[PDB]
């Protein structure tokens, strides 16, 4: 029933900007908190940012706090992540996660999209 699919990814120059997306279906997207987790080519999972169930509370990782931005589209049920400055270390595959309950964790994960830098 619950399904998550991401879109948006490709080659960018260092210091460039690219916006990722995450579509949701099978559940009320406007009631579940969403987070972005990226997996580097080294296969190490790194948490990026979280947006609350209503978008009022937002948290970022220490390394992307000043360049990344997380936002919602409740009517369209699509989650957007915007990056203003992609460094060399930002190359990874980004996963859309439905981390609503902190006591239960990321119970659902998207297919993921890859991002690479030139």
């Amino acid at each position: 029933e619950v399904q998550l699919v991401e879109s948006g990814g490709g080659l960018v120059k260092p210091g460039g900007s690219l916006k990722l997306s995450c579509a949701a279906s099978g559940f009320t997207f406007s009631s579940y908190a969403m987070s972005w987790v990226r997996q580097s080519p080294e296969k190490r999972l790194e948490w990026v940012a979280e947006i609350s169930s209503g978008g009022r509370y937002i948290y970022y990782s220490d390394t992307v706090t000043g360049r990344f931005t997380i936002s919602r589209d409740n009517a369209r049920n699509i989650l957007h992540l915007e990056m203003s400055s992609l460094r060399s270390e930002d190359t990874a595959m980004y996963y859309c996660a439905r981390g609503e309950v902190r006591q239960r964790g990321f119970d659902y994960w998207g297919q993921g999209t890859t991002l690479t830098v030139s």
Binding site: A33, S52, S53, G54, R56, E100, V101, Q103
Partner: peptide, 15 residues
């Protein structure tokens, strides 16, 4: 109620 539930979730971790 939805806003307060969001506030509760932000603090406790669950709605």
């Amino acid at each position: 109620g939805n806003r307060f539930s969001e506030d509760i979730r932000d603090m406790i971790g669950f709605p």
